[PDB]
């Protein structure tokens, strides 16, 4: 008995209801609040240049073809009654392949209140479109947007708003940064128009502002590649007259930096400009490839100009290590400033 | 004309909810086999993949019909009219029919009420496998079946006479497996919400070592047996010395890692890696007898001499002693 | 080198069309955002204006409904069309490129900046 | 007879509205579910995530669907549970799932006479864990499974574990090849959000990483290598042809090695503790190469005191390594 | 007033015939494809692929859809596009393709007084263009995307380009990692089959590959190595050590180039531009040695000739390895 | 109403109609004409031993319960039609997970003659099994099978026939080629029975012809394997007193093949027995690793017995040219002609 | 030395059904695709019948549904029947094996070739 009451209200919403019509067609233009609750904020893929996010996706508006009188203010309904009604058509501009998740049911609810007023929101997962600048990889930050709003609908027929204040409408959970390299700072939210074959339509947009941790590549490739250029210059204090010591000592430093640099291009991520880390390893090789040439100089001022071969080690027992020592200066001032 | 009235008098009335004598007897159920091809064993994953032909066999006293036509050979378009058992595989991890060019579905009714019904599946079964003797061990990769709703008191299973059969087993894709046999059997499994006939199939490998002797046991004892060139070498060479002493180690350890790159991160020690721990110990052994020999160069020197004359005997026979007694155990276990 | 040379802008009589066009050379800025920035004499920098590369426009408040903005792809050229001007529009036009890091709302995120161009609004 | 069922369970669908969950407007309804957990595989440390696959089970009364006359639970075809309401369970950290469809849909419906309903289903899930790998690979995980209402809130629906700390089952029978399941826990609470109060139930496990066979065979190339830099020591410092040429290949054989170490482990960022050891060895033949340089500089004029060094570093060297595993292999052991 | 809308679209689909096309038994119907690419990615040489994302407009009108006393152009629900008729459009060189389905499918209907209708669709296509790789990294592209009607034939349908040369958009937007889009091209033709004579549109687009990503990767390198290898013609032939560790890590580093470049393209039969310069490059490093050992061959002999050679050598290397470079970049550029 | 008149031939045709008989059902045997159209014959992987293909997949019969009179012969209907009525349930024997495609709609069409005879082609994309046998890898050549026919109904209710001449059956596009590594030699066009549990099935067989190019492999297995082999070689000419000009040529060239045939395996196909490929890596291992021996033995024997070590190099300068002659020559004659 | 060693034949008189069987051994050639061949005295070869490892059976022209062939892939054999022998039949059948390229229905696609058995018919 305590059901038929509200089969009736149900069937009486539907009866004569078209869901082929947007509310107020022709008469005035429907508006949609929209707000985001990202449960969680996922890996961020730089081969790929694109991001993943799983969001509680809400939207409200209003419908007077379903307004009501009952026991009840509020229906908290089953999500196939969705399909009975007419809901907004909101895609993604930059989605690349989304998921709304169906188990083990469709993750869907509706709820209508005795005024028309709708409320439905979807759990979804979206990997969206991030371009990335890297000319200055590995200290590089970047602004992944999400913009999203109706594909059919233009903006004289539908227009989308927050719920709340701009900033209070996309709300983050603290347990859902599964970034591993990334640094999720913050967020901007905005709201702005395109212009298509098809009309103008409003989009809705939030940008996401994260920054690259820098700790693995210190580890992997910055530590051993400055080891490997104050290595080579131990070459200057072994005594000039051990040719065969400093020979091999000198070779086989350029050979370690030829290694450390091969295996440092393995995880650098396919562009086609030079990045802050090819700068590093290139002018660290110059280093490593002069104290060879210098040793040359030396080995060849031996027994002809004994005199003017000591001067030169004292003189490269102090430049070599002072430039080296600017060059990290003038590096490290250069990109984290930035 | 008159199939078609037969047809539309069977399912007039039917209801397809309900299983056959739903309340007098439970439902037997003759399951047939027909294993096209058992695909590779992917030992990571610990899964392997087969083709079947799955056949069930049932009577229905609905479906009982009076005419001179006897059985009526149908397409897959009335599958979905009458009631179908829901057996499901146990141990599946990935199962799907065959949907091109239509499904692979066959449904033929006899007029006493038999149904015949088939269709081909592709199934990725799981296989768990102990890989203390990999690769000199024998398998038996399951494969489970058995109603999911129904207890034993509604729907029980019973191989037929002929019920499991293979075509050709040597085009098949296995390739680091040679298969053996088949044994089905039936048991009972209790599970929370009842007691479930399951019906097992068991395909039996054996070891097929063709594969891991070019890959890892062959290098593995080319890179030992270089290492014994050092000890005809004169002891004044020490690039020429040292360079088989730390080249070999390197190229042991590359050896060792491409060892497990067809095992899963298993905890313990396959009996390949006992092969290539034990080599790796030889080509270190041959490094440290070097260095071992200018030890020796000045503290006794008559002693040295003789180093290299005990290397060239002790590093041969010793691996010639491992080998002996490593493929004797294994191999005759 | 990345130059923004502002091209247009003079003198109009308290209404009417100015469009104002910027020129970009030394770099590609297809995947950048081009915006137009405002600074009249001793108020402040104002945003205007701004286009990513999908199209997508943002309008300051004060200006909306007012300035069309346009870009030119294939010239790598952003343009900012000006009607219904009023004498509270006279200022310095700038144009500004960048990756809208922390808001393209923001000055600060434009590494690329013009040189002006003086709009005078006579009434 | 079994037209009797028939027409029983078509009065139960006449008049049942599926939009409308039981007791609407009423009092919550009761949720019991059990899980029996079948297979836990796939723990990926690249993806942050693992792959499980369960029979999930949910209990709950219907008065809608309540009979009489007929003493029987009966178990009606899967496909009948698309007219009946089901609760919109969902798990909140899920990546991927879907439910098995072989041969038929994975899914069990069972009326009883009082109204009550057990559905079942086989789902193979893709849960999301982070993972905390500084300790890698020593390290110990916690992998959660959250179950949920979506659209219902706590004054529709309630959740429990049906059968108290054993509606989990199957735990203890899941081998994994590099983990060890420690212990699972069952949690159940509430959870606000913005749209209101909803049920959450909560299943743990705690994963353990093994020490069997993969440390040796990443540490011991390490550490074979930081010894034998330990050989100069011992060769006079007036052969500085020998010295040098040992003491800076092992720098280069130990950047070899870790350059193809970065190939072979499972690509994470955050620096891990195989790393922070690595680095250690790295420095310690560093020092073994930069120890030589400084008495090639001295022993010309200090004879005696090039000597003491020498004699020295065979002591210190190994003792300051020592000290570096009994600090490493205690703070993470 | 909205009422009157649905009794308008109620007559419109009341004795509809989606069976039939418009104007059917008549003249053929016009429809015009508008194209906005949205982004172009994964242009992938080892698959012979690339991926294309587009809103894909077709445009054509339909006497059976003309309303009147309504002064709007009506957009309804997309569900509504699966009871009017639509072309049956497909792209013969599609690989897999699918059309968007988040929030709801991304699919625009979208009528008009006259009975005009608008059908566009969001799809992402995974197209295939073989590629001539005979000049790569320095070569160039052309992928096509071939647009068709499957059922009807020139008799019954028309493709055209709606607005000619700007029907595509997009185009200039698109910024690719390593290509640069030179140009684009549209062309209409009729393609003839054994069933009838099908309309085709064709969009081509031509791509010119960026070296700069390979200078660093695979050139670079290469000569480093090989300028290394000159180190040669500075060093006594005493120093073993220095020599035999130029050699090994010369080999290990090349097949570290090398493999890194095999395993990302396929197995092509012939010379690509890039090996004809890893050839080339091991040509001098394999003449090096080789004047290494005649000098030390005839060194005993004529030690004055043995010197004279390796001073030429210091420049004859140097200056003929310049010509090689200068003569293979003004041949493919 | 001029549309009407079509309208209400196909409401007839179906008025009655049942689709889950076949035609000519208890009076003859339904004939099945079928011809494939190879848009493109794709890549062919040997590590799954499959290939995959797109055809047009053309099938006609006749079914008189379709007959109909009106101002048009033949109705090219929407494939939305083929549903309804009975359409032949082929399936390919060796076919793997295959594809029908469905963008932007059904890639079906169906016609209907005024006979009853019936055009039902599709676009498939077929993967199907290949057997291999690569004991002559990688100059063997395969013929890869195309088997398809009924599921359901045994050759005594339905045969399958080729529309032309088997040989004509079949027609492969100009451009279609996508194969990278193999050449379409031709086809061959058959038919068949195959008998079962259920009966006897009349089944179509199809076999392409390839044969694998070489070029890949000579490029990156046999010259740098060849190379190797003469660089070993030169030690043979130095003097027996050069010890570090013959360790530098002894200790590269052993641990070049060393890397090559490691480096070669991961790419090799995985079977269970040896291929061309193996011998030649083994042969050519055992010149580079024999020549190793020569200089040790030969270094053995210096100081002591310097007239026997001064023998053994003369010896091997023509033995170990000429044998690896021998070996080529034996070796590419084995292969190449068969 | 790879042998097909055959057995079955003989001679029969006004017809009547008979069986030849084949054998091999070495390598198990179940991977290949084993036929029968009938070579009149004098005429030439002619191709029978072939069974490959899927168990699909073709058939030649003259004895399309007069004789049987099946495989026995267990003890890697084929068998052929003769039935209603007729005097044109007397000739003699090999035993053949091979992968079947270009075409199975062609002598020279099998690489191994039987002994030969001899079968006379007399009527
Ligand atoms: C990184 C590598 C580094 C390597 C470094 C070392 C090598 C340096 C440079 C080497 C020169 C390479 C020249 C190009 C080789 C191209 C190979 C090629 O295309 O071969 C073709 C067939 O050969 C040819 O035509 C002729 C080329 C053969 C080359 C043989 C070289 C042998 C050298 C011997 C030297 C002996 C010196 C003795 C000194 C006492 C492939 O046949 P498809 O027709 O494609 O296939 C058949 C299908 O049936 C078709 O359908
Ligand atoms: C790095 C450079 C590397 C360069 C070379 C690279 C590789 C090139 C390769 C060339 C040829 C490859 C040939 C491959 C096939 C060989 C045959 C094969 O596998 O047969 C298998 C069986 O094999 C084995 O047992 C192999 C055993 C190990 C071989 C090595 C043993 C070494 C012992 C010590 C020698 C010490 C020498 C000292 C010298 C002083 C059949 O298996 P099923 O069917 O299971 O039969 C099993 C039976 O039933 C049991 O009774
Ligand atoms: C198996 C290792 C052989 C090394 C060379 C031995 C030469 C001996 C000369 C008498």
Not at chain 1, 175 to 199: A, E
Not at chain 1, 282 to 299: D, G, H, K, M, R
Request: net charge positive; with cysteine; charged share 20%.
């Amino acid at each position: 008995d305590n059901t038929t009451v509200f089969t009736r209200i149900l069937d009486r919403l539907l009866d004569g209801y078209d869901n082929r019509l947007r509310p107020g067609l022709g008469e005035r233009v429907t508006e949609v609040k929209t707000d985001i609750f990202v449960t969680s904020f996922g890996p961020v893929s730089d081969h790929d240049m694109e991001y993943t996010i799983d969001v509680f996706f809400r939207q409200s508006w209003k419908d007077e073809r379903l307004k009501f009188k009952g026991p009840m203010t509020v229906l908290r309904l089953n999500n196939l009654m969705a399909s009975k009604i007419w809901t907004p058509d909101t895609f993604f501009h930059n989605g690349k392949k989304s998921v709304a998740h169906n188990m083990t049911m469709p993750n869907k609810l509706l709820r209508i209140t005795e005024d028309g007023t709708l409320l439905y929101t979807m759990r979804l997962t979206v990997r969206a479109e991030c371009p990335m600048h890297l000319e200055d990889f590995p200290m590089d930050a970047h602004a992944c947007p999400l913009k999203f709003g109706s594909y059919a609908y233009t903006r004289a027929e539908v227009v989308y708003e927050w719920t709340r204040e701009p900033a209070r409408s996309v709300v983050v959970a603290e347990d859902g940064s599964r970034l591993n390299q990334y640094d999720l700072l913050g967020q901007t939210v905005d709201s702005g128009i395109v212009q298509s074959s098809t009309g103008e339509y409003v989009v809705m947009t939030t940008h996401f502002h994260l920054k690259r941790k820098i700790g693995y590549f210190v580890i992997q490739t910055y530590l051993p590649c400055i080891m490997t250029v104050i290595l080579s210059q131990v070459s200057f204090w072994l005594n000039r007259e051990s040719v065969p010591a400093r020979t091999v000592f000198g070779v086989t430093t350029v050979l370690t930096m030829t290694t450390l640099s091969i295996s440092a291009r393995n995880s650098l991520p396919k562009v086609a400009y030079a990045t802050a880390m090819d700068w590093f390893i290139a002018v660290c090789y110059a280093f490593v490839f002069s104290a060879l040439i210098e040793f040359a100089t030396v080995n060849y001022f031996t027994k002809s100009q004994p005199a003017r071969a000591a001067k030169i080690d004292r003189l490269s027992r102090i430049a070599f290590p002072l430039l080296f020592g600017i060059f990290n200066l003038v590096y490290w001032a250069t990109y984290l400033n930035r | 004309g008159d199939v078609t009235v037969i047809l539309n008098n069977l399912l007039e009335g039917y209801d397809n909810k309900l299983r056959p004598d739903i309340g007098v007897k439970p439902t037997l159920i003759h399951t047939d086999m027909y294993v096209n091809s058992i695909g590779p064993v992917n030992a990571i994953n610990m899964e392997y993949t087969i083709d079947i032909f799955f056949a069930q066999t049932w009577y229905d006293r609905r479906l009982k019909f009076n005419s001179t036509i006897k059985v009526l050979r149908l397409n897959s378009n009335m599958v979905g009219k009458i009631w179908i058992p829901d057996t499901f595989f146990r141990n599946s991890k990935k199962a799907d029919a065959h949907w091109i060019t239509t499904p692979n579905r066959m449904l033929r009714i006899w007029n006493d009420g038999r149904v015949l019904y088939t269709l081909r599946l592709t199934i990725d079964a799981e296989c768990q496998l102990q890989l203390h003797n990999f690769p000199m061990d024998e398998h038996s990769c399951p494969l489970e079946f058995s109603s999911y709703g129904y207890p034993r008191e509604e729907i029980v299973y019973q191989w037929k006479r002929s019920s499991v059969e293979v075509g050709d087993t040597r085009s098949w894709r296995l390739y680091q497996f040679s298969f053996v046999g088949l044994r089905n059997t039936t048991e009972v499994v209790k599970t929370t919400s009842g007691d479930y006939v399951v019906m097992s199939v068991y395909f039996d490998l054996s070891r097929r070592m063709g594969y891991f002797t070019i890959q890892t046991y062959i290098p593995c004892t080319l890179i030992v047996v270089l290492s014994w060139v050092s000890f005809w070498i004169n002891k004044d060479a020490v690039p020429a010395r040292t360079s088989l002493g730390i080249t070999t180690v390197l190229t042991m350890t590359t050896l060792s890692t491409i060892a497990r790159k067809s095992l899963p991160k298993v905890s313990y020690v396959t009996a390949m890696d006992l092969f290539v721990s034990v080599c790796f110990i030889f080509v270190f052994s041959a490094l440290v007898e070097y260095g071992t020999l200018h030890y020796f160069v000045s503290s006794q020197p008559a002693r040295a001499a003789k180093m290299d004359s005990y290397a060239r005997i002790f590093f041969p026979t010793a691996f010639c002693l491992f080998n002996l007694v490593y493929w004797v155990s294994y191999l005759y276990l | 080198q990345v130059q923004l040379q502002e091209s247009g802008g003079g003198l109009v009589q308290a209404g009417g069309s100015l469009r104002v066009s910027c020129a970009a050379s030394g770099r590609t800025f297809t995947t950048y955002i081009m915006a137009w920035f405002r600074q009249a004499p001793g108020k402040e920098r104002e945003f205007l204006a701004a286009m990513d590369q999908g199209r997508i426009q943002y309008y300051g408040d004060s200006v909306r409904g007012r300035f069309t903005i346009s870009r030119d792809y294939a010239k790598n050229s952003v343009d900012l069309q000006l009607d219904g001007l009023r004498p509270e529009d006279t200022a310095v036009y700038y144009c500004a490129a960048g990756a809208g890091f922390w808001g393209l709302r923001t000055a600060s995120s434009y590494h690329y900046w013009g040189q002006g161009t003086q709009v005078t609004v006579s009434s | 007879n079994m037209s009797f069922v028939k027409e029983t369970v078509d009065k139960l669908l006449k008049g049942y509205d599926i939009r409308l969950r039981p007791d609407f407007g009423g009092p919550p309804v009761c949720v019991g579910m059990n899980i029996d957990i079948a297979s836990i595989d796939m723990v990926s440390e690249v993806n942050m995530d693992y792959t499980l696959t369960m029979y999930f089970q949910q209990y709950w009364r219907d008065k809608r669907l309540a009979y009489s006359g007929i003493p029987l639970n009966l178990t009606l075809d899967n496909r009948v549970a698309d007219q009946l309401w089901v609760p919109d369970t969902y798990f909140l950290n899920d990546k991927k799932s879907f439910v098995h469809g072989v041969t038929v849909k994975n899914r069990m419906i069972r009326l009883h006479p009082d109204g009550t309903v057990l559905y079942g289903l086989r789902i193979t899930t893709t849960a999301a864990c982070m993972m905390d790998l500084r300790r890698y690979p020593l390290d110990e995980q916690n992998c959660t499974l959250e179950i949920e209402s979506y659209g219902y809130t706590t004054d529709d629906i309630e959740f429990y574990w049906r059968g108290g700390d054993k509606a989990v089952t199957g735990v203890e029978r899941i081998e994994l090849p590099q983990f060890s399941i420690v212990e699972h826990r069952l949690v159940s609470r509430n959870v606000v959000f913005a749209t209101g109060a909803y049920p959450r139930l909560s299943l743990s496990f705690r994963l353990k990483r093994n020490i069997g066979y993969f440390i040796l065979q990443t540490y011991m190339p390490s550490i074979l290598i930081t010894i034998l830099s330990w050989v100069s020591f011992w060769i006079n410092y007036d052969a500085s042809a020998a010295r040098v040429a040992l003491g800076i290949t092992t720098v280069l054989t130990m950047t070899t090695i870790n350059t193809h170490l970065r190939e072979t482990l499972p690509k994470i960022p955050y620096v891990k503790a195989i790393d922070m050891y690595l680095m250690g060895c790295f420095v310690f033949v560093f020092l073994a190469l930069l120890e030589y340089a400084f008495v090639n500089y001295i022993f010309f004029s200090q004879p005696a005191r090039a000597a003491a060094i020498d004699r020295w570093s065979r002591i210190v060297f190994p003792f300051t390594f020592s000290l570096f595993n009994l600090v490493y292999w205690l703070y993470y052991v």
